[PDB]
Symmetry: D2
Subunit: 123 residues, 4 copies
């Protein structure tokens, strides 16, 4: 975990995220999305659970990206929840929630759900 | 948003989260869960999109809590994705993903999905 | 369950669904949505698990509505997954997935997630 | 769609589902799960939206399986929401919700979310 998590990861859509997993469960980094109302890099912050494992389980973690930077303001935020599996072919398997800011009338349709798999190799 | 978000919020399960929304989209604080394999306060970190709105839309945001502190290590992490609606009765409406670290055989059943509504009043 | 489920239910958005729970786990009926690219009644079909419970647990069930009828064709389908809780104030608590048919380029953003609570009283 | 959907499909976990898509949006068939508190075949019912598409979009559909048959009663139900993409390598991409019947105290953790991809070839 931690050391194993720090680095550059790529997902199936071609997005890239660079993260640093700190000693006490913090995750900090940047995310560049290959799809969406996203342009350039966005700041990401999250946490991982730093004391994962005598039965080769994954390390649970999550992070958030607010889609606003100096080139775009998409009025939305995405959170990724999943686990890090290390090894030869280490990966982070996630499910994500993308919520857009809406008026109250459209709040029922404000959130998209999806899944992303990240690897150290692209892809 | 931001100022409006900073403070103490409570949800329908009796959990409490105190957050500070910083000038540039950062969210930092603590979360105390009334249910689960959770005991005491846990650190939370997230982001909000700091330039939300000429049509009274909500402010999108998200945060993560890794369920590990000095009293418990639940080997899981939860991410909340939603939006802040301010006003008289301001609230943060969210959907969450709770992922547990599992062996590869059980990874298909590693994530729970739910929804929480937070208010400034409890509840 | 079954008998308890058969009837008319209403949710927080003002939608109404009439269902008949058959002896062997089948659910058949119609759904009229108060929001969306929906007009009139749509056919629904689902299942419930007909042998639910010495510890007052809910009865798990699910149903699907394809948003096509003789007045509208929204090219989408919604599935509701949840449980029936009977009693004085019986309710069906659900989480739903609404998938729209998209081109392959937009498949990552094809599904919305939400939650609906149905009661026998409106609302 | 419809004709294209009728047949046997397999997913990444080795589950198999045989379905018949009827002329007016109905889906009927059986599902055999390779994982879980599932043994043998279970009945499935759903709907698809029968008038999908001048821009090669997928056909939205959904189905439900209550995990009860003559060999097992898992007190749960799963709904799959997604779209059918036809062609050489046709597939049905889905996201699913598995709800278990719980007591009211545990209702917040009653639903798991996941994703399955089905192909006509196994896998
Ligand atoms: O990498 C990405 N994953 C998808 N989820 C999301 O929010 N934007 C898309 N880009
Ligand atoms: O406040 C809480 N919300 C629920 N989601 C979660 O992860 N733990 C529970 N407590
Ligand atoms: O009743 C409704 N619930 C929401 N989900 C959905 O698919 N349409 C909306 N209407
Ligand atoms: O095929 C399967 N998919 C998964 N979802 C589910 O409910 N059971 C598992 N089996």
């Amino acid at each position: 975990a931690e050391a194993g998590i720090t680095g550059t990861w790529y997902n199936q859509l071609g997005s890239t995220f660079i993260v640093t997993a700190g000693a006490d469960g913090a995750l900090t980094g940047t995310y560049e999305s290959a799809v969406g109302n996203a342009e350039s890099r966005y700041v990401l912050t999250g946490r991982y659970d730093s004391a994962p494992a005598t039965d080769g389980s994954g390390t649970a973690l999550g992070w958030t990206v607010a889609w606003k930077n100096n080139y775009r303001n998409a009025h939305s935020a995405t959170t990724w929840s999943g686990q890090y599996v290390g090894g030869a072919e280490a990966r982070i398997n996630t499910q994500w929630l993308l919520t857009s800011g809406t008026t109250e009338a459209n709040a029922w349709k404000s959130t998209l759900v999806g899944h992303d798999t990240f690897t150290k190799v692209k892809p």
